[PDB]
Design a protein around this ligand. Structure first.
Ligand SMILES: O=C(CCN1CCCCC1)N1CCc2[nH]c(=O)c3cc(F)ccc3c2C1
Ligand SMILES: [Cl-]
Ligand SMILES: [Cl-]
Ligand code: NA
Length: 445
């Protein structure tokens, strides 16, 4: 009923826009209950939350009829209604617009700094009434699209650049989402065109070609590699489903050591494995005292069990995984390399790491703990580690999703087998509040 009309409202939107939202695990929920009673808005925080409508009016979330929940599992929750009302429809398209520009890659990374957006915004901000000398400022575009706070921080005629966008991010996301909403709601479109022509044309290009272009480019990339980025919804579903069979084919001992390995067994195991950097140097003469011998045998048995578990698992498609590390990644002598000072990545150090390591191969003799998603957990994040390894795993590699067995499921761990050869492919400085060095590696089978 009203649920159908709500669906029909969304289905008027371009299929391409809905595609981009779906790609990042975006879900659209239509509900007859209050938004704050929905499963997705359960957190105690959503109780005392407020939202601001397209026209700048504040309401309690509980009282409102649509909300784009952002973050790592984006959701658009919509109260089912008639939506014959254009005043209502425009708010849905507004939150959807926000879901696009704020929550969906790649738009939420590049778009607002794009010449096209900045150019359109500058032109609207510079509209004139007259055509000759000393023509009066025309505030019609700013009044239609710019929020209260943005009108306070930006004057008419004043120039917008990347640093102004970065300092007023949510305010420019509003401009984008409201342009989007007015463009797509048929009874608001003509006013957008009349009063902010530059932003109308900006949205017309997105609607008529460039949403589609961005979408096809995503489809193309997904054909070559699977990359969940920081989004957890699709990642967790893929991890659980893909390795379910493998998990049923583990022994009790194998499951126990997988768990133990994510806990206190981690260091003793990986230290043992890294011992001689792959050189075979037998220890001969004398013997270990009884406790050290027992401890060593125990570690050897754990490695036997982990080896056996991971041999039973094969990654079935090209996959990107993520791992945070320190400068010790490049060797013991880099321990105090001081790659990052005051949250700033030293540019010349990156140049010499690049000079020394780019193209070089190496063996990780340790098992390789990685995350199926980027930076999911406080233990291994940008704040503590100045280097993110972005690792391309080719189909056929022995590794497995172990998060549901881990003492830390929130890490979304993909455990890759020991003894693979890796290559340093690329070095990139990533800016925000700390910068970091992204190092692309590939496994070489
Ligand atoms: O040093 C440890 C672990 C030490 N540990 C075991 C547990 C108790 C003592 C403390 N590392 C190196 C860096 C790192 N980086 C990740 O991005 C990551 C992602 C995952 F999903 C899982 C593990 C990791 C790890 C694991
Ligand atoms: Cl390690
Ligand atoms: Cl490290
Ligand atoms: Na094999």
């Amino acid at each position: 009923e009203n649920s159908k009309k709500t669906q029909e409202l969304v289905e008027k939107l371009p299929h391409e826009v809905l595609e981009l939202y779906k790609n990042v695990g975006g879900e659209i929920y239509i509900t007859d209950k209050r938004l704050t009673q929905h499963e997705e808005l359960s957190d105690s925080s959503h109780k005392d939350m407020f939202i601001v409508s397209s026209e700048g009016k504040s309401f309690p979330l509980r009282e409102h009829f649509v909300f784009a929940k952002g973050g790592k599992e984006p959701s658009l929750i919509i109260h089912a209604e008639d939506y014959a009302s254009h005043l209502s429809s425009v708010e849905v398209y507004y939150e959807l617009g926000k879901a696009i520009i704020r929550d969906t890659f790649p738009l939420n990374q590049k778009e607002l700094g794009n010449p096209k957006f900045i150019n359109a915004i500058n032109e609207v901000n510079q509209q004139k009434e007259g055509k000759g000398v000393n023509a009066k400022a025309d505030e019609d575009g700013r009044d239609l699209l710019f929020g209260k706070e943005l009108k306070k921080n930006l004057e008419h005629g004043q120039l917008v650049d990347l640093d102004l966008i970065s300092g007023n991010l949510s305010e420019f996301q509003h401009v984008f989402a409201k342009s989007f909403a007015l463009y797509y709601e048929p009874h608001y479109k003509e006013a957008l065109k009349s009063y902010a022509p530059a932003l109308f044309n900006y949205m017309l290009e997105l609607d008529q070609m460039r949403f589609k272009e961005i979408s096809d480019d995503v489809k193309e990339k997904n054909k070559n590699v699977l990359d969940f980025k920081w989004y957890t919804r699709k990642a967790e579903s893929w991890g659980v489903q893909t390795f379910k069979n493998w998990k049923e084919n583990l022994t009790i001992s194998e499951k126990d050591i997988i768990t133990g390995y994510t806990g206190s067994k981690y260091d003793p195991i990986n230290e043992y494995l890294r011992k001689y950097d792959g050189e075979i140097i037998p220890n001969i003469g004398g013997d270990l005292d009884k406790k050290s011998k027992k401890a060593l045998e125990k570690i050897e048995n754990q490695i036997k069990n982990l080896d056996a578990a991971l041999q039973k698992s094969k990654i079935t498609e090209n996959l990107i995984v993520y791992r945070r590390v320190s400068e010790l990644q490049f060797g013991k002598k880099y321990e105090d390399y001081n790659l990052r000072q005051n949250g700033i990545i030293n540019e010349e150090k990156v140049m010499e790491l690049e000079s020394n390591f780019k193209g070089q191969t190496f063996i990780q003799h340790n098992y390789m703990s990685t995350s199926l998603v980027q930076d999911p957990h406080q233990s291994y994040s940008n704040d503590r580690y100045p280097i993110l390894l972005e690792i391309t795993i080719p189909e056929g590699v022995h590794g497995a999703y172990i998060a549901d067995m881990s003492e830390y499921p929130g890490q979304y761990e993909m455990l890759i087998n020991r003894g693979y050869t890796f290559k340093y492919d690329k070095f990139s400085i990533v800016k925000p509040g700390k910068e970091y060095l992204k190092v692309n590696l590939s496994i070489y089978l």
